Amino acid sequence: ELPEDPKWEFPRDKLTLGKPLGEGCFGQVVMAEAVGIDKPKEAVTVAVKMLKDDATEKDLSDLVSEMEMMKMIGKHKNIINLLGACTQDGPLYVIVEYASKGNLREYLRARREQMTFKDLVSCTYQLARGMEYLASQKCIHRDLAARNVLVTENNVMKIADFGLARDINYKKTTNGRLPVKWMAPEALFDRVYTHQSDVWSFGVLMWEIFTLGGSPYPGIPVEELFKLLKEGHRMDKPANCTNELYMMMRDCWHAVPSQRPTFKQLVEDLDRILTLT
Amino acid sequence: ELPEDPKWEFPRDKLTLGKPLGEGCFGQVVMAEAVGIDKDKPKEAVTVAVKMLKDDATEKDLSDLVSEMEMMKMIGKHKNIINLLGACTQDGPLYVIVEYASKGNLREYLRARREQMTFKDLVSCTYQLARGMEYLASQKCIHRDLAARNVLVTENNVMKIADFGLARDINNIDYYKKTTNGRLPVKWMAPEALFDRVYTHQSDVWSFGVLMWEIFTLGGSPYPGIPVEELFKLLKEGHRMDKPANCTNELYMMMRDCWHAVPSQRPTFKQLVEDLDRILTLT
Amino acid sequence: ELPEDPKWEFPRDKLTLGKPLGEGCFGQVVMAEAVGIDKDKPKEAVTVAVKMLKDDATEKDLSDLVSEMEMMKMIGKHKNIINLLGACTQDGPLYVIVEYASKGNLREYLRARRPEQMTFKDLVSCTYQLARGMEYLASQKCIHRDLAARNVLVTENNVMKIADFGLARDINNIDYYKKTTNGRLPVKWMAPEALFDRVYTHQSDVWSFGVLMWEIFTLGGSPYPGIPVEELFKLLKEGHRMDKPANCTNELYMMMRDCWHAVPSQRPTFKQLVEDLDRILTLTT
Amino acid sequence: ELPEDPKWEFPRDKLTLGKPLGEGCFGQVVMAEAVGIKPKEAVTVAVKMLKDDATEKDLSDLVSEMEMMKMIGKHKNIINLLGACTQDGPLYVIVEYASKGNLREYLRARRPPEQMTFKDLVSCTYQLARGMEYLASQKCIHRDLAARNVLVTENNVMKIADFGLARDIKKTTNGRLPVKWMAPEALFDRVYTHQSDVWSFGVLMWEIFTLGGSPYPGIPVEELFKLLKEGHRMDKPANCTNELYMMMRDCWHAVPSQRPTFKQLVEDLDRILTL
Numbered sequence A: 001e002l003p004e005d006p007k008w009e010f011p012r013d014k015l016t017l018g019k020p021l022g023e024g025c026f027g028q029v030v031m032a033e034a035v036g037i038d039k040p041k042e043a044v045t046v047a048v049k050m051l052k053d054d055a056t057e058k059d060l061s062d063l064v065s066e067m068e069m070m071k072m073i074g075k076h077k078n079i080i081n082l083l084g085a086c087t088q089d090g091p092l093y094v095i096v097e098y099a100s101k102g103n104l105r106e107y108l109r110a111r112r113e114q115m116t117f118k119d120l121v122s123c124t125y126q127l128a129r130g131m132e133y134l135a136s137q138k139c140i141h142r143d144l145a146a147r148n149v150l151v152t153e154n155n156v157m158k159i160a161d162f163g164l165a166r167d168i169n170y171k172k173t174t175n176g177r178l179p180v181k182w183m184a185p186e187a188l189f190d191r192v193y194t195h196q197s198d199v200w201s202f203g204v205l206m207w208e209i210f211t212l213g214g215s216p217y218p219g220i221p222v223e224e225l226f227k228l229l230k231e232g233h234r235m236d237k238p239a240n241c242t243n244e245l246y247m248m249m250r251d252c253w254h255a256v257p258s259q260r261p262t263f264k265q266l267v268e269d270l271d272r273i274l275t276l277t
Numbered sequence B: 001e002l003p004e005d006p007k008w009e010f011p012r013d014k015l016t017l018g019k020p021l022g023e024g025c026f027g028q029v030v031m032a033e034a035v036g037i038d039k040d041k042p043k044e045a046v047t048v049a050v051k052m053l054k055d056d057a058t059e060k061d062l063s064d065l066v067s068e069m070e071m072m073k074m075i076g077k078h079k080n081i082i083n084l085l086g087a088c089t090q091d092g093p094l095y096v097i098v099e100y101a102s103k104g105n106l107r108e109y110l111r112a113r114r115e116q117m118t119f120k121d122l123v124s125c126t127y128q129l130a131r132g133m134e135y136l137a138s139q140k141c142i143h144r145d146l147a148a149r150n151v152l153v154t155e156n157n158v159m160k161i162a163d164f165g166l167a168r169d170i171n172n173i174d175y176y177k178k179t180t181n182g183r184l185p186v187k188w189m190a191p192e193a194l195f196d197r198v199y200t201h202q203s204d205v206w207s208f209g210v211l212m213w214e215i216f217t218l219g220g221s222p223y224p225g226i227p228v229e230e231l232f233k234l235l236k237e238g239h240r241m242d243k244p245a246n247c248t249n250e251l252y253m254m255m256r257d258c259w260h261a262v263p264s265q266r267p268t269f270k271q272l273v274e275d276l277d278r279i280l281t282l283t
Numbered sequence C: 001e002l003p004e005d006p007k008w009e010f011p012r013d014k015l016t017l018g019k020p021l022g023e024g025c026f027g028q029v030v031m032a033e034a035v036g037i038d039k040d041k042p043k044e045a046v047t048v049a050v051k052m053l054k055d056d057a058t059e060k061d062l063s064d065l066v067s068e069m070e071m072m073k074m075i076g077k078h079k080n081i082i083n084l085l086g087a088c089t090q091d092g093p094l095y096v097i098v099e100y101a102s103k104g105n106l107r108e109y110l111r112a113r114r115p116e117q118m119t120f121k122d123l124v125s126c127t128y129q130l131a132r133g134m135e136y137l138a139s140q141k142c143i144h145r146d147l148a149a150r151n152v153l154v155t156e157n158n159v160m161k162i163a164d165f166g167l168a169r170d171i172n173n174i175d176y177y178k179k180t181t182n183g184r185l186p187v188k189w190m191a192p193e194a195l196f197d198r199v200y201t202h203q204s205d206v207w208s209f210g211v212l213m214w215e216i217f218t219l220g221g222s223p224y225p226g227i228p229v230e231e232l233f234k235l236l237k238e239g240h241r242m243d244k245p246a247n248c249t250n251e252l253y254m255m256m257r258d259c260w261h262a263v264p265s266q267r268p269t270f271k272q273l274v275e276d277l278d279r280i281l282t283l284t285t
Numbered sequence D: 001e002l003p004e005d006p007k008w009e010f011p012r013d014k015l016t017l018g019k020p021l022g023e024g025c026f027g028q029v030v031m032a033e034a035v036g037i038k039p040k041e042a043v044t045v046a047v048k049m050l051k052d053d054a055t056e057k058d059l060s061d062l063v064s065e066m067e068m069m070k071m072i073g074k075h076k077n078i079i080n081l082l083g084a085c086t087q088d089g090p091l092y093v094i095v096e097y098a099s100k101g102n103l104r105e106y107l108r109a110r111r112p113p114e115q116m117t118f119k120d121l122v123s124c125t126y127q128l129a130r131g132m133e134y135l136a137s138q139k140c141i142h143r144d145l146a147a148r149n150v151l152v153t154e155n156n157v158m159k160i161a162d163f164g165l166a167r168d169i170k171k172t173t174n175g176r177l178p179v180k181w182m183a184p185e186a187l188f189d190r191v192y193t194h195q196s197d198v199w200s201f202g203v204l205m206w207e208i209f210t211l212g213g214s215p216y217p218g219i220p221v222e223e224l225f226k227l228l229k230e231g232h233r234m235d236k237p238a239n240c241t242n243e244l245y246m247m248m249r250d251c252w253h254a255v256p257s258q259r260p261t262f263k264q265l266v267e268d269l270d271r272i273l274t275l
């Protein structure tokens, strides 16, 4: 039923299972070592993303689309790479890179052995760079939340959850099935997405980073949240982040999409900060 | 955002917060004692289940919860379907107040009894989940998600259907293929919904057959040993799950009947209510 | 060596072959004149077209004819459908004879007369004959799976006749006929349920009939114009349906849309199509 | 929708659509100017594409045909793949263009009542013969060898074509191949052998020597099996020299081991051209 790209395909037999990394509602993945993925005969360890016993058709449609999305994006230091994809006789298995420390939100939450401010800027800098590569490839993430951004072993940040991604190169969905708190007003109300919306989500992502994994829009119910955005309630600055970042961070959250800064602008703005810290 | 249902609204202050009865991936429900709701105008506390969106939320998830409140008001009351005691639409975050089932949901109700359950008792639940469906489909609605995991058993064991938020009104046009197929789990879905993208009343009966399978083989997963990806390939082939152990052939023939390839020829929901009534009567 | 059917047999000596009329992937038909083939008109030569194996013969083709011949025996005579007149089944080559329509297959014939002259009433009238023809098949519990405009032969004086019966199969006790999957059918004229669920029925035929009206209405135009077969599946799930032809009246177009309903239970059955068409037909003058 | 092989894929924009070049009931082939190939120049190619009446099974046959072509490689005397469009949009499989079409027609349109002489008739046989030789040792077999499925190349170079019914090396359905060109060994027991094609080749030789005349003239397909079951063999064509007639008999040998091997046939033919 599912055709196999020759370059991506990997034999089912070669791969070996490991203790499951996680079992989310979105998808199930099991850590595993796959040998000779590149053949160099190296038994690399790759997390595998796969379906649950009961899978929604949209999940089936989404994971497969997520696998396809990885092929288009070029290998980049920040975005999580796809090393090999399996579409054998058995159930579809996707092989991804393994990030030893888990997602960004959970990594900071476990460091409230300490996180110096320079590292926080560095963590922020890498995300901008990743988005910049995606912008060049015209891919829009649609999430950009700390909770699905894998931070790898030796602290190099990695973007993740490309299942929701679409290739940009307005009206295919109402921009539902996405976390509202991390979602842009333009997408929320008019159901269209653009690079700016990721930047707004990225603006929310910065609060996740600067609140040491803290949840955004504290004390506000999602139903209530529709109203504040129209009137302009933007969250106050996190303690650790310096004031200069806030003007940039707040600028990302804008009423009109055109005003919001593009990624090229953000990385360049961010590159200097690391230098003077 | 939210209007006013004078009969439906229940003030936030009257209802009391409680320990959570599970946190679903889609939404969170927390137990509550409803001071305000009146069994017969007592104004005495009655236990209840509050269903609320958890703060991290899907864009659709807010909509689905709102749809669930809207869907239930239209349905009315039947002894085989979950009640709809209250809503807190007027203020704060949406809170939906729905009656509580002591025994819990049917799928795990059966797994934990693999206690003693007589064969007929099992027929009774299957017979019952059929009476409820008949009323539900006689109100020009398609539940669209029938599965054991969503049939809730009350204390004293009276089966109540749940998760009504997904099902859509089919009153004058029968759910043409608008859907993008993210609506339902593949294992419990009908083939026409899976392939054609059309859902009719009959598709609940295809789903109902799997519900008969789950109930009959002690809350067991269907299409076991078969990956979802591979499932589609033999659905066209027509291979179907075999009769669960200790199930009478007559129920199995009824089960296979539900599994008819042609939606038009599947047993009508009235027939299912009618047969089981005869079947159950013998013993 | 096939078993003889006494009624169908037609002596080889009586039949004397004539020049060939087109070629197909199922074999070929050569015009022939058979003496007194039609009962109640004995000792007369009535032109007949004989379906015979192509010099190069597909094994499926040999089997195909045998099956095709069997279908003719069961359907029974009808003014609007091609009818078996006789058959050659004995020792030697197997010639199967079938009625000869002077004008030819309908889609091409229409393509003959796009501004010859064809008035709108004839186009509506022509559809009525096909709908009536289909009803007999529905009544006789058989389904013509490949019901498309190109295969409908129209006779001299326009008595439209159905054709290319090898695909159609009996449904005496089982309605779906779900066993056959993707063996040999056009995607564009296939119904949606059958294409995806591998089930065919009479409501399923009407969808093929639905398209057949469109081909006929726009002078034998190809169905689903400008859209490739490969990408047809995606639009079909989404609900795209071809637009009404410029020639078409609104009333016919609603029936066309009516014949394309997603749910088979909902589409009209052939009795309704013939009845609805008859009224529309009545007001033509 | 379909996995794209990087080597084979050719961008849709690059190849101008062009116009029709003959037709077949199963699929449609249309000539086109395909810029590029590693010439880096624009030259004509015939792309085979799904026809309007798309059979459900027809799509599978097209994919199999593309697959067959990929493994074979390139030979002088056999039509070989020139890359295919693949994943984006509609699927067109591209093959090399032949100028004069199928050989059977080419021979018919060269019957008197510069026509080919006897050496030219022999020359076609050698080419066709060597091509089977190239195909031979690839662990592949054509399964349908006849004049129509053989395509001449502008400037007279013969190329075997229409590779869909080939399975690179007996559970096959064996419904879709013609009775007359089928090997007796193959038709009756449904067995398929690399050298079972010599009979097909033996029949093919006959088409060339009578400039395309239909094989077993006067014998209907229905009655054909009986003659094959008993001892029988097509008559030697008038144009062909007697030495060839025996080759056909040798090619038609009752048991598969006995039919001359493709190297043998090709080697035997060379002497004849050489002589």
Ligand SMILES: Cc1[nH]nc2c1N=C(c1ccccc1Cl)c1cnc(N3CCOCC3)cc1N2
Residues within 6 Å of the ligand: A021, A022, A023, A024, A029, A047, A048, A049, A096, A097, A098, A099, A100, A101, A102, A103, A150
């Ligand atoms: C797909 C993928 N690729 N790489 C991954 C990974 N998934 C996650 C993950 C975490 C929570 C929820 C969902 C998921 Cl999918 C992950 C989790 N825990 C890791 N850790 C092991 C060692 O110690 C700390 C914990 C590592 C991970 N990395």
Ligand SMILES: Cc1[nH]nc2c1N=C(c1ccccc1Cl)c1cnc(N3CCOCC3)cc1N2
Residues within 6 Å of the ligand: B021, B022, B024, B029, B049, B051, B098, B099, B100, B101, B102, B103, B104, B105, B152, B162
């Ligand atoms: C919406 C609703 N209405 N009524 C409900 C209820 N939700 C559930 C539930 C069950 C499975 C998955 C999700 C959910 Cl939300 C529930 C769970 N467990 C119960 N039991 C308490 C006492 O101990 C045994 C267990 C009772 C429940 N009742």
Ligand SMILES: Cc1[nH]nc2c1N=C(c1ccccc1Cl)c1cnc(N3CCOCC3)cc1N2
Residues within 6 Å of the ligand: C021, C022, C023, C024, C029, C049, C098, C099, C100, C101, C102, C103, C104, C105, C153
């Ligand atoms: C089986 C049969 N029965 N009757 C037939 C007939 N076959 C055909 C035919 C047509 C299209 C495709 C396939 C076929 Cl087989 C036919 C063709 N051409 C005719 N005409 C000759 C004189 O010029 C005008 C045209 C007449 C025909 N009649």
Ligand SMILES: Cc1[nH]nc2c1N=C(c1ccccc1Cl)c1cnc(N3CCOCC3)cc1N2
Residues within 6 Å of the ligand: D021, D022, D023, D024, D028, D029, D046, D095, D096, D097, D098, D099, D100, D101, D102, D151, D161, D162
């Ligand atoms: C695969 C391929 N490669 N090259 C091809 C070609 N297909 C054919 C062909 C022939 C018979 C049956 C099927 C087919 Cl598909 C072809 C036919 N006729 C040509 N002629 C053009 C000029 O006028 C006389 C006719 C040219 C052709 N070229």
Ligand SMILES: [Cl-]
Residues within 6 Å of the ligand: B262, B263, B264, C263, C264, C265
């Ligand atoms: Cl139906």
